[model samples]
Target: MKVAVLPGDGIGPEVTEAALKVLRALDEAEGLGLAYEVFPFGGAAIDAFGEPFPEPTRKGVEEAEAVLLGSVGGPKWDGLPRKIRPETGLLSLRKSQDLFANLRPAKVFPGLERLSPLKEEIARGVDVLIVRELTGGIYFGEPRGMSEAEAWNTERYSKPEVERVARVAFELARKRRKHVVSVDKANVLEVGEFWRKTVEEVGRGYPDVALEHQYVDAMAMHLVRSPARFDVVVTGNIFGDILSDLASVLPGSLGLLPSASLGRGTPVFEPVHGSAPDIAGKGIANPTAAILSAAMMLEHAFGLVELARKVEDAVAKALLETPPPDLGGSAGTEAFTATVLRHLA
Candidate 1:
């Protein structure tokens, strides 16, 4: 498989390097025939080509079967024009791929319950997949504008848009607990009602999966009160954005979160954490999220289910055996990755 590697700014290079090491090991052991090519992107791309997502990098990503991206953006590129900024490059990349569904999984790793803010009873066995509708809804809604006094943005979702993302959620649920909770504000918002109806129609197509509806407010409360009750959550862009970030806290560390953006083009797998410029060159930056993202790429992009699970299992074991500095252990990036590698072997 041809994989486009985008080691963006700051700690991106360090963490991505760790992920590549693990991937290379898997490729060698399993003969998976994986091929990777590094491309300039984000702040690094600006330095090389004067544009964040340059033509060469865009072409490379287009041709690749999958893209593994480390974090992007830092203070160094913050002074640039909005169009040429590193964040703009990320938006362009996602737009170019037409990525509509974003999957973010938040799970408490065994033996790491102590790290969670919630009591162990509430945090234990907490595994949730948030399938967010990325390309549409309020974020890309029409007739959006802001004035000096009043600001307004449209919240809209067509039947097809809702159906497509709903299917993505249900399909993913089938592989997990076979339950789907569609969240919206149907009580007041017309768009929310439409979204609920559209998802219900899609639910009929998948009779095996159980479907439920929750108001976004209620869902937010439920997420904190009883996160384990949910298996898969499907929602619009804005709600998903907030809910996923809220769920990220459940696992206790952003360093352990991974996300996947999938749709009509090349799928992108990335860590949920940011560049962490303060720790940019330091080896202490955690690589678990990036490594798990590689594992997601293995499953979602390459259909290497067993290999992906092996990577996940190794990560779970490594967290207990050699917790990273973020988790209050002394191991830096290389040492933590080494522990994972040992587990993988």
Candidate 2:
């Protein structure tokens, strides 16, 4: 399979390179035939071609089996117009790829208990997938954007949008611990009310998968107290934006969390964290998350579970061996990537 690569800017290339190395190792270890095709993107492409997502780059991604991107957007382009911003290309690519069913799976790695605010008992075994309504959410909802800084962003959901994601969440819960908790704010938000009603309507289709609902705020508090009780969480855009970040803590840091961004046709895998301009060239940005994301891409898109599992297990082994400085350890980016690769044996 040919993989589309967007190296992006800053530490983006650093982490993207690390993920490629992991995929190469997986291909060798599991005997999976995976080919890679790199496409120019982000500031590099912007500087070279006067376009962040060049026409050719978009075409290449469309032709490839899957796409893997590093972080995008930096302060250097802050002066650029919104139409020419780097992230606009990314959103365009997602829409072009037709990737729906966005999945962000957060599991507390076997070790790394020291990173959590809660005790190890509470943090350990805290594995769950946050099914964010990727394609249809407030961001894509109609009547969006601000005209004069009044800022109008509506959270709208049709029955089909809510129902489809609800099915995805239920199917995920079945594969997981057989339980799902849908979070929304039905008290005041009309979108939340629609979300609650739609989830109930969809839950009836699958009775084996235990389903429950929680108001957004209550679920936020429950994450700290009753985290172990959740398996799969189906939530709307705003709630997902809040809850997924909140759930990232259950695993470790935002930098260590990996998220697979899907739309429908081709999936784009990336880290959930933002581009840290402070440590862009420091060679200390955690690549494990990106590496883990590569693992997910291997399993979810490329049909290579054996390789993906090996990569995931290898990452856990490396973190247990010695975490990076951000997670309160001494290993740098290369050290972390190499450690994970070494254990892939």
Candidate 3:
């Protein structure tokens, strides 16, 4: 498989290098025949080509089967115009690739339950998959504008958009707990009502999967109060953005989360955490998220399910045997990755 690697900025280079090391090891051991090429992106691209997502990077990503991206955006690009900012480049990449289904799985690893802010009983055995609808809703809605006096943005969703993302949630649920929680604000927003109704229509096609609807507010509280009750959660872009971040805290560290964005184009796998500019070159930033992301690419992009599971098991064992600094241990990025590599053997 051809994979496009984008080591964006900040701790991106450090973490991505660690992920590549694990990937290369797997490729050599299993003869997976994986080929990858690095490309400039985000702040690096901005400096090289005067734009965050340059033409060469775009072409390279389009031609590849999958993309493994490191975190992007930092304080340096905060002052740039919205059109040319590193964040805009991310949105542009997602839009250009038509990545509409973002899957974020938050699971509490064994031996690390005490790190969670919640009580160990509540945090134990917590595993949830947030299937977020990307490329639509308020994030890319029409009639959006800003001005000195006022600003407004539209919140819209077509039936097809809702239906497609709903299918992704239901399909995923079939492989897990066979339950789907469709979250929205049907009582107040027309778009939310439409989203709920469209999802219900899609649910009929998958009678095996149980479907339930919850208001976004109640769902937010339920996520922390009884996160284990949920199996697969499907929501719009903005709601998913907030709720996923909320769920990230359940695992005790954002550095342990990985996400995959999929649609009708080349899928992109990446860590859910952003570039930690503060610890950019300090070598303490965790690489588990990035390595797990590579593991996701192995399964979702290359159909290497067993290899992916091996990688995930190695990560879990590594975390238990030698927790990273984020998890209150002394191991730095390289040392932690070394532990994971050793476990992989």
Candidate 4:
């Protein structure tokens, strides 16, 4: 599989470096020929090419089978206009790739459950798959604007948009515990009502998968109360965006979560954490999420489930002995990576 590597900004480069090393090791060991091409994006691209998502990077990303991205955005680029901000690059990239299904799996690593704030029983079997509708809803809705008096952003979703994402959720549920909780604000918004209706219609096609609906607010509370109760969760863009970030806490650290955005063509894999600007050059930023993202790339992009499990198992084994500072351990990026590599060997 060919991958376009976008190490966006701040600690992105730091974690991307470790991820690339693991990818190279896997390529050499497995003879998978997982080729990668590095490209500039986000603030780095804007500084050099006057565009957050540069044309060259676009070409590379579009042509690759998969895109592995590190986090983007930092305060350094916060002064830019909204249309040209670092985050704009990520949104544009998603649209350009037509990526509408974002899968963010939050699972507490076996030995690291103690790192989580949730009570041991609550965090025990916590494994959730957040299937976010990426392209539509408020993020890409029409009639959006900002003004000194009042800013407005429309939250819209068509039948097809809701149906497609619902299918993705049900399909993933088929591979898991066969349960899907479709989240929306059906009690209030007409859009949410429509979303719930659409998802119910799609569920009819997947008889094996049990489907249920919950208000986004209620789901948020339940996620904290009993996350293990859920298997697959499907929600609109904004809700998914918020809920996935919230679910990241289930595993203890944002640095341990990875996500994949999939659509009609190539998929984009990325760590769920942000750029961590404060820790940009500290050399202590954890690379687990980025590395696990590469594992997702392996499974989804290359159809190498075994190889992906190998990577994931290596990470799990490494975490048993030592995790990065975020988990209250002394290991830095390199040290932790070395432990995982040793397990890989």
Candidate 5:
């Protein structure tokens, strides 16, 4: 299988290397054939081609079966124009690819509850899957601009956009706990009212999955108060972006969270963390999230559930033995990856 690998910027390449090591080992040990097509993207793409998401990189990604991204954006690219910035490239790439659904799973690892910042009871039962509408909403809506005193951005979504992402969440919930909490600001925003109505209409198709709604404000409070109460959460673009990041903290560290963006074509897997410019080039950057993202690619893109589980188990084994530096232990990227590889063996 061919996979497009974009090791973007800062610590992106370093953590991506750790994931590649594990993937290569899996290929050799399990006889799983994976051809990696490396491409410069985000800031690196800007430096090489004067554009954040270059044409060649776009062509390469379009032809590949799946994408594995490390992280994008750093202070070096912070001063660039909004349209050509690294984050802009990321948003453009996702929009161009028609990746409409973003899946971010947050769960406390078996032996790592103590490591979570929340009280043991709160963190112990937190296992939530956030399904976010990626392509539409305020992020991609038109008539957006800024000014000295007045700034405006549209928050909109068509019925189809809400329906499709809602279905994704329902389908996922059927396999998990058969419950979905659709979050929106329906009481205030017209767009949110439309979103809630569309999601409810879509819910009728899946009678087995119990569906409910929550205002964004109350949902945010409860996520930290009782994350375990949520099985699957489906929300519009802006709300999902905020809630998913909040849920990431429930797992103790962002280093342990991986995400998947799916829809029209090839799905992209990536760690939820940023480039972390302060830790760039340091050997201590945690690779767990990136490596788990590779495992996610295996399951969602290639249908290699067994192999994916092996990777997940290996990561769990490594963490159980000794936490990474991000989790309080001192294992550097390479050393922690080696331990995972050993567990895989």
Candidate 6:
């Protein structure tokens, strides 16, 4: 699979380098032709070019089979206007690709359960899939602005918009344990009520899949309480935003999870965390997320299962010895990556 790499600001480059090293090793073992090319975003564009996400970068991303983004945005570009921020590039890329369904599977692995904030029993087998509605929400809603006095943005989800993402969730549930819980706030907002109705209608299409409904707020409570009870979860755009980030907390670092953006065409895969300007060039930023992101890219775009599993196994095996410092471990980015690649080799 051909991947367009966007090594965004800060540790973006560091993490991408680590992922690439593993990708190269996996290519040799699998004998798969993984053509990877680099594009632009982040502070690098601020230096050489005018804007963070330029025309060329967008064009390359649109044409590639899939795009992998390193973390973007940092204090270095904090002074820049919101219009030119690295995040803007990401939003544009998502819109350009028409990617609506974002799948984030959070699993508290055997050894890594120690890294979880909750006690071992609470975190064990905490395997759940967060099907986040990516394209529409308050984050991408209409009439958004930041003028200083009071900025405003409205959250909107039409019947078609809510149903499409819910369909993706139900289909995902079919593949898993066949239970789906749609999280909404029907007791309060009209949007949540509408979301509930649409999800019910979507559930009807997949009658074999058992369905349940929960308030997004209550879902948060249950996540900490009975997380393993959920197989697949569908929620409105706004609720999904908060829940997925919180879901990351369960697995440990924002860096431990890998996510995928899917829809009509080619899907995009990325790590869960943001650019840590503090750790940008130290070469200690973990690359496991990025490498596993490539695994997602291979599964979704190229249908290369063996190639993907190799990467996943490498990620699991790497942590057996040590994890990155953020997970309260000794290894840094390069060392962590070397550990993973050594297992791959």
lDDT of each candidate versus the true structure: 0.94, 0.82, 0.92, 0.90, 0.90, 0.81
| Number of backbone collisions per candidate | 0, 7, 0, 0, 0, 1
lDDT of 6: 0.81
Candidate 3 per-residue lDDT over residues 202-297, each given as its tens digit? 999998999999999999999998998889999999999998988989988888899999988889999988898999999998999999999989
Cα RMSD (angstroms) for every candidate in the order listed? 1.0, 2.4, 1.8, 2.1, 2.1, 2.7
Q: Which candidate achieves the best TM-score against the true structure? A: 1
lDDT of 1 at 343: 91
Q: Could you tell me which 10 consecutive residues in candidate 4 have the lowest summed lDDT?
A: 108-117
Q: Please identify model 6 stretches exceeding 4 Å from their true place.
A: 138-154
Instruction: Report the C-alpha displacement of residue 136, candidate 4, in angstroms.
Output: 2.4
Number of the candidate with higher lDDT, 1 or 4: 1
What lDDT score is found at residue 141 in candidate 6? 82
lDDT of 6 by residue, 1-345 (tens): 678898887778888888888777878776778888898786677667778878888778877888888888877777888887777777767787888988887888777778788888889888798998887877768888878688888787788889889998987777679999998888998888889888888788888999999998889999988787888888766788889878888977677788988877657788887887877787778777888887777766787767777778778888877777776677988789888878777
lDDT (Cα, 0-100) at 262 in candidate 5: 90
Window of ten residues with lowest summed lDDT in model 6 = 41-50
What is the overall TM-score of model 2 with all chains considered together? Answer: 0.91
Alpha-carbon shift of residue 107 in model 1 (angstroms):
0.3
Candidates sorted by TM-score, best first: 1, 3, 4, 5, 2, 6
TM-score list, all predictions: 0.98, 0.91, 0.94, 0.93, 0.92, 0.90
Residues 1-345 of candidate 4 have per-residue lDDT tens digits of 789999999899999999888988988987987778999999889889988899999999989999999989988889988999999999889888788999999998787778788998899988899999987898878999999999999999999999989998998889789999999999999998999999998989999999999999999999999998999999998999899989988887878889999998679999988998898989999999999999998887888889889999999988887778987888999999999999999
lDDT of 6 at 322: 76
lDDT of 5: 0.90
Error of 3 at 156 (Å): 1.5
TM-score of 4: 0.93
What is the alpha-carbon lDDT of model 1 when measured against the actual structure?
0.94
- Model 3 scores a TM of 0.94
